[PDB]
């Protein structure tokens, strides 16, 4: 696994959502940035798509890092079809991903 | 023809035939059959042969040496040339298990490799107290004499330079593991892979990504193929230095 | 190795480095300042440059000195050309030493 | 009866913890060809279990110094490749292939609690970490027929044993 | 079962407080593998939680469950089932070993490499409180 990022705390219009494990270190520079969308999802054929809004990296001498992302649930999309909607609640712990580009172009495009 | 004349028709057609990226054939490509038109056209007796193997000669996996792109730029821009091409780097460096293989001989003074070991731990290792995966380069020195090779090892080790070498005390047999942990060690800085047959044992014994890095002068070894290899040949090993 | 610092946390606009050394007390005087150049990198060939926004020095009892820098990251530097545009991720730590004189003359020459 | 020469000789010479104070103690054990490898181990076992202190508790840690004589470099070294591989970690000055004697390494090893006991290869390197420590050290001589020459500065008990087999009950 | 409690009672600290835990291994031969099973299920059913290196149907022995079932606090001991899956353990195990016989009659053979410690009882009762 590449990525491992879960949403931890889940608001009306808010996600945080903790990377636990990164390993790639290209997805985090790239697929992690303050504005790059998610797939907030336990499954691959309906997820949450989010943008991202803040985010803020810790190390620390003993504990592990804390990579903490803010994101808000821009719209929900279920088998290929991007349905805008901004109040569908996930309910955490949920699984997220760095959205695909198919799943970027479909939020300007299935509306 | 003029000199600048040349240059962008040689590389256009290697680079169809290869198909491969612009640092594939002008730093990669073109550099290898330079000296290769030159080394038959440089003998005393033969020198037309039949191009039919000198495709498959350019196709080594080694950056040759080039003396005409030597002389002519310096120093300070061939070893510039080759530092953004096979050496590139980001802003994170991934915790890999580089191996850095290095050419040792008996004109090469202790105190110049051990600057350029300096210099490969230093740009190569992340050993911070905040780091959850720390990471230190692979060195392995070759083509010298084992007193002459014992020789730098107790060198470094006087000036707080700790490393492994799968030799705990005297009489152990090799053990991998210890080249591992000290992969994982923020105490040690750096791992010393003492041969040939220590090597490909610990190659076995790693299954995060692997990058080879050679630097020779003549000799050069049959590193594996589905490794990433950058085997790139200088004239002095304090070449080495400006590349890593 | 007279400076010894370190990036501990990492914003969308912000760095905190922690000095984790300082034997040099000219480099504090006179590099360390607010305004002053930082250069952010694990290695010498790819970079990102940061100007000194706040710091403080905190000193107690029987712990050890907390340096702490502020530092906002305004460009990137790769093979000693700058490339202006700070939203590039650097993942902490990240090793820090004040930055060379070709390093600032390089914001302003290259852009 | 065996067990009241095993008693005699628990108490005439060693102590049952010596206060459990930090100190180089040095268990000086003289192995033969003819005694097995496996019985070595025992010993070794036992002493590094009695005559060490490497809890996180603690903040005075310490660690015993072992050294072989009378017998061959071959299972010398043998015997240490199994010790390794057992996970009892020990040092003994030579970090590295084609070191040299470095006695600051069995320094820091004394203090290590991850570092179970210090391995001496032979007299040379017993002599050069004696006068690297300088905090107190005492020699526990366990010998059937051979017995090595002590400096005479040093706190030295000399007991004489049987067989190798009962250097194990005694500490 | 009376001496497989009291083995693993004894031999065994599972306690949350330590940081280095350890189990029994235990070994039996000269039965058939009827009661062998049926002391294992019964085993199992009083929480007596064991592996024997076979975590599913048709498995291929895995020392491997045996590493870490000696290392694992709910894990109480450790089965072994005959000589071949005894001995493929023991090259696995790279910490220290120590084997303790219990036998009436028949004695099992034991690779001399390791430490061995030989016991011959009246009967079988003896074994619980020696132990």
Redesign the interface.
Known sequence: NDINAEVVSVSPNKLKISVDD?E??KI??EK???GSYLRVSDNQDVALLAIID????????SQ??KYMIEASPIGLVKNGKFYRGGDSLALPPKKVEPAKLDEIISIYSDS | KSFDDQKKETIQIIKNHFQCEDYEAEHYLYSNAFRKTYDISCNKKDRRIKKSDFVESINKSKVLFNIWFYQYEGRKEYLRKLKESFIRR???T?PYARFFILEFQDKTDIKTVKDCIYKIQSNWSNLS????RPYSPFLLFHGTSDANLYELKNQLFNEDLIFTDGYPFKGSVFTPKMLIEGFSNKEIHFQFINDIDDFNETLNSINIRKEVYQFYTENCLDIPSQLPQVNIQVKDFADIKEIV
Not at chain 1, 54 to 61: A, C, L, T
Not at chain 2, 129 to 132: E, G, I, V
């Open positions: 990164l790639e270190f985090a520079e992690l940035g303050v803040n985010f803020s990296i810790e190390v620390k001498e592990k890092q | 980001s802003v994170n991934s107290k905040r780091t959850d």
